[PDB]
Amino acid sequence: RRTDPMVTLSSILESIINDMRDLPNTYPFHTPVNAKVVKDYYKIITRPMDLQTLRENVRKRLYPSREEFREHLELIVKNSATYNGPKHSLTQISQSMLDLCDEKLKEKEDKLARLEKAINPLLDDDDQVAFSFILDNIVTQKMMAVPDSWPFHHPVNKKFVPDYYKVIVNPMDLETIRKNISKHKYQSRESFLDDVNLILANSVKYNGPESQYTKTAQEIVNVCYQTLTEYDEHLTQLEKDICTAKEAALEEAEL
Numbered sequence: 001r002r003t004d005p006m007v008t009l010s011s012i013l014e015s016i017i018n019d020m021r022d023l024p025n026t027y028p029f030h031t032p033v034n035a036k037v038v039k040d041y042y043k044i045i046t047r048p049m050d051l052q053t054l055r056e057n058v059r060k061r062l063y064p065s066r067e068e069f070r071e072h073l074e075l076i077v078k079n080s081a082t083y084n085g086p087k088h089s090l091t092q093i094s095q096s097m098l099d100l101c102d103e104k105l106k107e108k109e110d111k112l113a114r115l116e117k118a119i120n121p122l123l124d125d126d127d128q129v130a131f132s133f134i135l136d137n138i139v140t141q142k143m144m145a146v147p148d149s150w151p152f153h154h155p156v157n158k159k160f161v162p163d164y165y166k167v168i169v170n171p172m173d174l175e176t177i178r179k180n181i182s183k184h185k186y187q188s189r190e191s192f193l194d195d196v197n198l199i200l201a202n203s204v205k206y207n208g209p210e211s212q213y214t215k216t217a218q219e220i221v222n223v224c225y226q227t228l229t230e231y232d233e234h235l236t237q238l239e240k241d242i243c244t245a246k247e248a249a250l251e252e253a254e255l
Helices: 005-023 051-059 066-084 089-106 109-119 128-143 174-182 189-206 212-231 232-253
Strands: none
Touching: 005 089, 005 109, 051 066, 051 212, 066 089, 089 109, 089 212, 109 128, 109 174, 128 174, 128 212, 128 232, 174 189, 189 212, 189 232
16 A cells, blocks of 8 residues: 655656666766865855765655756756856766656656655645635734733743743744744644644743733633634635645555
């Protein structure tokens, strides 16, 4: 049953690296230029690339799609253009590798498009963006409007509260939550609420259960819950559409 789409994609990329390595005359691009032999090379080339580095990157799961892989590959040709010359023999050799890569990626175009959706199912998904937008409005319109909430709007300032980060191991604030929303970190309200509740847990632990600041944090948490309830039906639909889209993508990658 379930194979990880990033493993499947990386294996195709790795196979392409090996086909490029096999090509005649490509050896100077297999490994990084040796600084001790080409003494000025890294003064000219500031983003170096070679087949070994590319393969380590594939291994490290750095590429979620064709596009980021190809970009790095192309840097091998651009760097040769710059260093050896746009029309130099070595530059035509590097281009021979880019050309083989494109041919192999065209060959596997349908499987790759499916792996790529499975790896990043919610890129430009209107349901995720709509869901994020509603959460961001709960934060800015409701949670940040709680009287005296400002000290929870941004991370605690160490300058005025110097033991904070010694006491609190997992700090959280509304600005950090908004940054998470902006990056579409939350797919359902459960993970958003983990962060919102962490704000109150930190204040119960640092300021104490009866502190005025804990009472404020408690009101921020209450308004968050009340507004989510208000919007429950609309949010359930979005959550359903998001969780379903992820699953459908992972299955079409298998099938």
